[PDB]
Amino acid sequence: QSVLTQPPSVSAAPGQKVTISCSGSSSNIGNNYVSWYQQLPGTAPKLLIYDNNKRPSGIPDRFSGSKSGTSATLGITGLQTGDEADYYCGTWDSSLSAWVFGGGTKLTVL
Amino acid sequence: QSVLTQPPSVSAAPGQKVTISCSGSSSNIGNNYVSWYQQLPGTAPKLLIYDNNKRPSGIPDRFSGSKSGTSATLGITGLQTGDEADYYCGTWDSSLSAWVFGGGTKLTVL
Amino acid sequence: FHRGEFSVCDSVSVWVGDKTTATDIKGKEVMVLGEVNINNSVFKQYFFETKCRDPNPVDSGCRGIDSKHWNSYCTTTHTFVKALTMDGKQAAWRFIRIDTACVCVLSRKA
Amino acid sequence: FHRGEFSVCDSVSVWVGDKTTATDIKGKEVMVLGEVNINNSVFKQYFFETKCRDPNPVDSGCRGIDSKHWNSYCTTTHTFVKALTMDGKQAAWRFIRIDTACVCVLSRKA
Amino acid sequence: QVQLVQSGAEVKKPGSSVKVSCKASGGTFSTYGISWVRQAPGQGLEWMGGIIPIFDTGNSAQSFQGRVTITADESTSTAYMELSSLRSEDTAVYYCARSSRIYDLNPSLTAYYDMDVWGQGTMVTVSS
Amino acid sequence: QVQLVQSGAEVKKPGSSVKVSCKASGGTFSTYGISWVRQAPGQGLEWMGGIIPIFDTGNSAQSFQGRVTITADESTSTAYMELSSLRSEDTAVYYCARSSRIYDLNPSLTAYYDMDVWGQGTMVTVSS
């Protein structure tokens, strides 16, 4: 079982704001930084968000990130068909001395 | 009036251990490092002790330094005629953002 | 103990080889040359830069600080390294300011 | 606030020009050359080293730390700078480990 | 421009050891901190470990019980992952990643890094 | 054994400005952090300020109300102290000192140093 708690599936209509939650403890999210990953079907994961809010070059302004205590949230504005992928959580765990990942969230668009 | 409190005069017999006190606050000594200076009559001051206990090259093992909270002490073992000089205190005052000195202690040997 | 869980401030080390401009030892903005020749062999000018990941890793400021008594935040310290800098038409070998660590600074509460 | 009274750990910066031996990027002990020539003009190999003044500036550990919840001490971080070295045979312009800052490291209490 | 080229997909017997390669096509291989993350078919991501080639300093997950042996060679610009004593549960897609950012580089702290640019992946199948 | 040579003793009128020199005999002048401490006849030591010649960054005491102007020249290896608008109370022995150790060198902290090696002194007498 995964350390970071993520919802199994999330559904939304095109051109709408959607949120994916993340849960943890003092050992990880509470005293570290959350990173988000986009994994398209039959494709390798891609770095979406880093250091809770920051996003790397190439990633559009449509993707947002926010952290509050032991929890973190991802925001996808102006939804499209291409966004339909599995979204993962990622943060460093000080007590475990290892990088811990989330369960994974299946984003489905009609 | 001096920020750091030092006794006005100190008297001791030759070949004896003698102590000079220093009284500071949380702003200086308490959260910093104490330095001691030797000023012979008609001579420029000389660095005796630095970083509470450490002593520079040339200074004999006879000179000692110790710090406990907002108060520091200087120790002169195996006293001699040459030791007869004015002893000063020195540390950094965080609130005043300036190096603060003591009143001065007149060491007298018979 | 030796191995800690985390520091008071989170650091981020990046090997920089794409340096074009930097602030010199005095304050003057100088032009940095990409390559440096050591008589027979050429080397790409690489600099080891370590900066602050976030100024406030904790809502109160730095991690593990006595929040009720201290006002704190994470600041980036600097180091001075010699670099092949171009001044107009002639090449010079002078020290430049570079990010080297992430430290915590304290301030008393009212 | 910006200007702080003092850091969590006290630093001490010294310009070193008397370097003879140093640890390389991997760990190998290398012989450091005292001078570096730019085909015509010569320069004395100078390094900016910043280390810890004391591991425990406060009895508990670092300054302004929540002592009742954290075990702390001041440790010296390193930077990697290109220096003219010689591995017994000839010139080698490779990175060497150098003291660059004084940071605080945390650990949870039982 | 800089891409991480992995080794070819393999099918191995239980108890064997598979060595997965990860070559950085281009340059500045020593700059990055090569990571290793595995993913079982239709399952989540599992972090294995990583290595910084410039310092030769490695870190591995405690859950693997020391089966993973992450090595690196700067000359060939390739980072290797060797998983000894293969189990049926080890059947996963093995990915390698890079990061120009190295967090908590302190002699008193365990240095870590994120997964910025990921490799194509290497499918390792354990037939039973 | 580097020594600090100061300017000659001067007698000035009130309102004037006295500039005291501090030449470093030997070398590595930029390495040091030149300090300035005054001492009235038969009185204690009073810290005025200091400057690091390599960074040209100075610090002065708030008690002086900005009368002190500490300057430095690496080429001549001499440090200067200029005290504008002289008063009768300013009659003191002016000393300059050096320190190879520079504490709190941080952009968010006021950098400081000790007085490891002191100068001979310069007697500045103010007439009235």
Numbering used by the authors:
A (entry chain D), B (entry chain L): 1 to 9, 11 to 27, 27A, 27B, 28 to 95, 95A, 95B, 96 to 107
C (entry chain A), D (entry chain B): 7 to 116
E (entry chain C), F (entry chain H): 1 to 52, 52A, 53 to 82, 82A, 82B, 82C, 83 to 100, 100A, ...
Share the article's original sentences.
The anti-human NGF monoclonal antibody MEDI578 did not show significant self-association during its development and as such, represented what we considered to be a molecule suitable for large-scale production. By analysing both data sets, three exposed hydrophobic residues unique to MEDI1912 were identified at positions W30, F31 and L56. The structure also reveals that while the VHCDR3 forms a loop that extends into a cavity within NGF, W30, F31 and L56 are located at the periphery of the binding interface and do not make specific interactions with residues in the epitope. Analysis of the crystal structure of MEDI1912’s parental antibody, MEDI-578, in complex with NGF indicates, however, that the three residues described here do not interact directly with NGF and hence their substitution does not impact binding affinity. These three mutations were most likely neutral mutations that were carried over during the affinity maturation of MEDI578 alongside other amino acid substitutions that do improve binding to antigen. The residues implicated are close to, but not directly involved, in antigen binding and hence the amino acid substitutions introduced have no effect on affinity, nor do they alter specificity of binding. Four of these amino acids (Gly55, Leu56, Thr57 and Leu59) were mutated (from Asp55, Thr56, Gly57 and Ser58) in the affinity maturation of MEDI-578 to MEDI1912. However, no changes were made in this region during affinity maturation, suggesting that this region may have an intrinsic propensity to drive self-association, but requires additional neighbouring areas to form a stable dimer interface. None of these undesirable properties was observed for MEDI-578 (data not shown). Following intravenous administration to healthy rats and cynomolgus monkeys, MEDI1912 demonstrated a ~3-fold shorter half-life and a faster rate of clearance compared with MEDI-578 in both species (17.90 ± 5.99 (SD) mL/kg per day for MEDI1912 vs. 4.74 ± 0.77 (SD) mL/kg per day for MEDI-578 in cynomolgus monkeys at 1 mg/kg dose; 25.11 mL/kg per day for MEDI1912 vs. 7.07 mL/kg per day for MEDI-578 in rats at 3 mg/kg dose).
MEDI-578 is a phage display derived anti-NGF antibody with a Kd of 69 pM. Here we describe MEDI1912, an anti-nerve growth factor (NGF) antibody for the potential treatment of chronic pain that inhibits signalling via the TrkA and p75 receptors. MEDI1912 was generated by in vitro affinity maturation of MEDI-578 and expressed transiently in a Chinese hamster ovary (CHO) cell line. Here, we demonstrate that subtle differences in CDR sequences of closely related antibodies can lead to profound differences in their biophysical properties and PK profiles.
